[PDB]
A paper describes a structure:
Among these channels, the Stelar K+ outward rectifier channel (SKOR) functions as a K+ efflux channel for long-distance distribution of K+ from roots to the upper parts of the plant. Interestingly, SKOR contains an intracellular ankyrin repeat (ANK) domain, which is absent in all the depolarization-activated K+ channels with known structure. Each protomer can be arbitrarily divided into four layers along the central axis: a transmembrane domain (TMD) comprising six transmembrane α-helices designated as S1–S6, a gating ring formed by the C-linker, a cytoplasmic domain homologous with the cyclic nucleotide-binding domain (CNBD), and an ANK domain. Unlike the canonical potassium channel, SKOR does not adopt a C4 but a C2 symmetry, which occurs in the C-linker, CNBD and ANK domain.
Besides the wild-type SKOR, we also determined the structure of an SKOR mutant L271P-D312N (SKORmut), which was reported to convert outwardly rectifying SKOR into an inward rectifier, at a resolution of 3.1 Å. Structural comparison of SKORwt1 and SKORmut showed that the pore domains of these two structures are almost identical, indicating that SKORmut is also in a closed state. Notably, our electrophysiological data demonstrated that SKORmut is a non-functional channel, rather than a converted inward rectifier, which was consistent with the closed structure in vitro.
Residue numbers in the entry:
A (entry chain D): 208 to 414
B (entry chain A), C (entry chain C): 208 to 451, 460 to 523, 529 to 621
D (entry chain B): 74 to 453, 458 to 621
Amino acid sequence: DIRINYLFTRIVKLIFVELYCTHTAACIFYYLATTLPASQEGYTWIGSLKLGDYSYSKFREIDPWTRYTTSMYFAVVTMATVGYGDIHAVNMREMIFAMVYISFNMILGAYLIGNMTALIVKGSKTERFRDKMADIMRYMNRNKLGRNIRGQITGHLRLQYESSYTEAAVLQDIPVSIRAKIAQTLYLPYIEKVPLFRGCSSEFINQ
Amino acid sequence: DIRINYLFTRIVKLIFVELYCTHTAACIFYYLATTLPASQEGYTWIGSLKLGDYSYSKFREIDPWTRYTTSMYFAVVTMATVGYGDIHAVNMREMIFAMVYISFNMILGAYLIGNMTALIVKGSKTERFRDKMADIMRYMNRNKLGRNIRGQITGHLRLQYESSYTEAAVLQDIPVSIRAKIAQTLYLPYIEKVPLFRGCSSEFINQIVIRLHEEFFLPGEVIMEQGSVVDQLYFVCHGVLEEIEIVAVLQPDHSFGEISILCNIPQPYTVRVAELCRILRLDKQSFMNILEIFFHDGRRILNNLLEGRIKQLESDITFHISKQEAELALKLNSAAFYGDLYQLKSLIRAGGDPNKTDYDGRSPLHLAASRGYEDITLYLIQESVDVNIKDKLGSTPLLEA
Amino acid sequence: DIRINYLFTRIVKLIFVELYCTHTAACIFYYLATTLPASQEGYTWIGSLKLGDYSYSKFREIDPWTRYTTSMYFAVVTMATVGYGDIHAVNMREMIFAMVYISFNMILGAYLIGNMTALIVKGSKTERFRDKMADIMRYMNRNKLGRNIRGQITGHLRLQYESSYTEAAVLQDIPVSIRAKIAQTLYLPYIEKVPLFRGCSSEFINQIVIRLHEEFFLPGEVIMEQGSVVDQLYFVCHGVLEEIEIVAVLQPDHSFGEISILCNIPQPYTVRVAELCRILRLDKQSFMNILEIFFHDGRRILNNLLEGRIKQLESDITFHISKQEAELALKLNSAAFYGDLYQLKSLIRAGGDPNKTDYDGRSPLHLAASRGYEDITLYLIQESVDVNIKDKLGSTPLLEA
Amino acid sequence: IVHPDNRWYKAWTMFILIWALYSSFFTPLEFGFFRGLPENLFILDIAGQIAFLVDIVLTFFVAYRDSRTYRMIYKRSSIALRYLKSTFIIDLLACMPWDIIYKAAGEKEEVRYLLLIRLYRVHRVILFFHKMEKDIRINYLFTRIVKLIFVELYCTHTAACIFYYLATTLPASQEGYTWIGSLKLGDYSYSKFREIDPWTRYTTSMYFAVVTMATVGYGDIHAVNMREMIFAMVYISFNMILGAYLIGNMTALIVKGSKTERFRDKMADIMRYMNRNKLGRNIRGQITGHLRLQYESSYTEAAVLQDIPVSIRAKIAQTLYLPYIEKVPLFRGCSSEFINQIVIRLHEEFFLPGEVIMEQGSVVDQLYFVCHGVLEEIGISEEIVAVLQPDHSFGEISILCNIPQPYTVRVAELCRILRLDKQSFMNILEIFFHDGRRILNNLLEGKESNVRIKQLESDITFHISKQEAELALKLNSAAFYGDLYQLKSLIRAGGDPNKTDYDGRSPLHLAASRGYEDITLYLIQESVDVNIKDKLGSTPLLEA
């Protein structure tokens, strides 16, 4: 769709795919802790947790809210490759899942950087103006030619950038029927006033 | 290899490299722990490890499985630069290996990002459409076009993208002959069903298929205007086209616009699009060029043109085909009258028989001999033009000299 | 802005953005610690913090300095994804902010890499030299060139890179007039000192400066061969050149290669490079066109050519200038004899006076009238060519017809 | 004297790179892990500064090359002013002995901070990487990788020596607040933090610097003090700029692409188009195989042989193209200097099999020479009327008679074709009138097997007669001005003294016109017609 910003759409899609993967990993990390019976919950990544003075010893019937947001906090930190270390895998089954999840984020993390780099490298229509003038300036500085001649050429580039609207026009992948009508609406008023075309027929000036 | 994918063939290589390096580092790191004697195992990275209630108080004879997955877990975490810190180097020899292993991953890690970035730099099909649309929008909005014409331009550009009408950007690499078979694969069935080309030779038809172009039109558009000279030949391959109060409906497998191409008669009707239609177009210049080479093919098409309102048109075109033959001799004699040697060369190899005369009767030799153009006279000798041809006066080309 | 750098103007913006975000996050994170009452400060990220022997047992009234740098330290470590883990969220509300703050840095962190990458994509001066050298090396090695000629090609490309001889890639944007003043800034002092151009008009000299090109030559190279027709005019402005046993030494502020540019005499000497030399060259097409327009300027140069071995050459050029004047009439009359309309138009507007005759004496009107070319006679009357001119026979153009 | 680029000077420059490399790495160790200097290392400190002192007094006697005219200034005054305003101020401060000054003025730690000004001479090593990067014998990818490693190894080394220095600022009584005095990795104490050994105390600092530089952050070693927190934030912020720079260089090399990547990308787009229409089964093999040869048959395409002086391009062309020109049948009996002019402007092109060079009915503007492969001519069902072999030149018949191309030519096998423009072809013909008539003369003699020449025989016969008439005018003009030197050249190269121009004149008539006896007897010895007659009825003797 052309009514929606293209940069906005790409950013939101990357956020959603990153949010959904993190949400799924958080719900699976907590599931692995419940596989072990309550007798040996001390081996789990959460039953042995102690952040400040909070216990986390029971690990169950705490509440569905604080038990979920601590799992999501574990998934977000490892997904961004921060790795505080307060929450980490302790079991052998959790180590296997962590290695698979971490390896998955390297592919996904490089994909996120690739999209962001692609948009910037594509262009800005202003760095090209700076790059073109920078190369010319080095040539002028190398020869150390003139003082007021610099203003003549630097000012010249200002108008060249401004006076570029129909250059490299993409009005080529258009059917001849459509191009015929638009031409008669813009170019035609500038043709009948030419002194060379006095008394010319309508179909001749149309061709 | 072409059978396998390309992005798949390079994503797996990156995974394999990072998988093999972690496997090697995990095995080497565990070897450094066994270098120290068992008496002082508390100085190692694993002899002093304690995750939960597990103590690793022996670091040996545990099992080859849990003692390997904990070493692999330490290597994978370090490679991705997560660094939980539960497992870390404790010894001087382990610090040196960690410094070397970590420094190696920076070069490898940047290599992974570079390969992934280069795969995304190549723009997608919809990525170029948005860039193209903005450029068209900028130009057409600057000139302040009417809102009525804005929709047709924007609506048609969308249709080209979805239908992939162009689909011929990277096509010049085809060495004509390869492209020739492709063109007749998709366009020949529609051409052969055209009543206009009934009885045409098979070799002649294949010559024009390669030069066709495909495009689509939305309903409500107008292809040709009333009383406008048409320089494009179109063939209907899909949809319904209505010609303007309706008069005739352009059924599929039909052709139109040929009247203005040959007879120079301005188009007497307007074609209005009723539904989505697939149209094949041919440029004016090539069609005239091909007809010049195949004179015999044109005769068959001309005869079937009358067979293909209709009765009145058939009588009218008979008048036009007669005068165009005479018109060739008018400019042929004028070129010889003025002595323009180069101009005459165009009307001999791609025109008519110079031996024929105009309405009054004047062979080009008659004018050349009387006007004393000696140089051009040798050319008529090479063409074996009749020397004793007599006009409606009783004179001969020799007598004029 | 052009006064300030562009690399500097964009690196600072990236630093400022990451500096302001960390400052905001540090202040907001400390606010969440003060939300809880002082009775249960052990549940905060800082009330329970203990780094070394420092305990943070009060978390208040310590000082506004050490209590801010520890919050800023936690924010900067998190932003760079280092994550030591000494300071981390402990509360449910602090986890939510950490999740939001960390997720924000992923987009911002990738943005920093994108700007830095786009700055390095633009290749350096030496980056393109290596790419160019490989392409030249691959081509010349495929044809198996001799080792003697390998050094000259490779050595010369190095000289162009260091000296920046081309330095004119982005130069067509100059609107001629701006470029005109640039050319005379660096090339005029060497041209005015040329003995051959002594006495030339100032306006004429400025016309050829814009069309010059600059190049450098290594010692031991050969610019022109013995007995070879040359088509480039060179002006010495640096170094020493030797002309071939030595004969003469090309001192600076001299010019060579002009013998064949006008008299068509093949070059009788070979120029050998002795030391590094800067040479300005001019192409044949530009030199011929300017001379044709400025007929008066050419006369001054021709007169001073003799003044600028030398005595023998001065007598020889007098023989050649005489025949070229007569040679104009030979082809001038031949075109009129054959009645070539377009050929005759070339030698009148940019040639000589049609009224002059050849060695025997034959005005183009004499041949045209005798040969009976009626159309061409309408052109000679335009230039007011004399019609009573008599050759060395006693006849007139009227009598010939 | 002046030493611009002497081989001995180039040895001195490489000699001082060793000192620059040594003093760049040893300075952080001297600042952080040392208080003063032991007598063992006193010799190296003195010897190092004297070596750089020589360089300061020697760079005033070294010429520098001009940045505008490339003129090698060689001037005493210009050399000194350039060096004084660029680096002399900072290069002299480093050479000053900051160790003996520190010990002589009691024991001031503030004056020892100036010892870090010697970290500037690492710029010598950076210039070395740039110097060898321009060399073509060394791999370009290898140079870039090594430079990135060195620029990161040096930064990590300096940070490790400053992290340990911050721990020694606090007195030994309160060492527990430092990042290292409170360390405990396994069962190791690290409590004393001093007199442990210089080796394990350094490698634990380097291990701290490497882990934080790569953004791993284990957390076993971290800042504990307020002064160490400030340094950590500055160092961490510095690595973000440097870390993104490292990724940028690696991405730039990969984004530049490879030849196989371009081949794969081009074929991938075509394959999607073919699969979209689901056209053909064996058609894919025809086109996929076609791209295989196109990738291989691309060696001189987009050649960079343009930024080369005309003198160099002249010799290389004569060493490759020339052995393929004199063998052309069209150039039989041509002079050496005429065949030299054409070979300068020749262009080389490669055509894949199946391509079409020229189409029937098109205007011809390029002259083509065949050197490799075979060519096929088509005209009319398609009929093959002629097959072109190597050493043959095609396109000359339609370039002299000004006719359109009558037989389109396709490519049947991989061919190497030399191309020359029509505009410059006529210019060489006009200059070389003597050799210009032989090209069409040899062409005319080929009217035995070819049929296109037979129908064009009349036009060719006109041109050879028209050109011959120009010879008579030039030959007659030679005798008018009494220049026998040019007359000899005009007659040996096929010139006929018994040549009559349009107006009845003869060279004998012009010989007697000015009473030149020397030119006269030459014509008689050449069997000239003394009684030759003109329409004016003027005998040569009567005109005399």
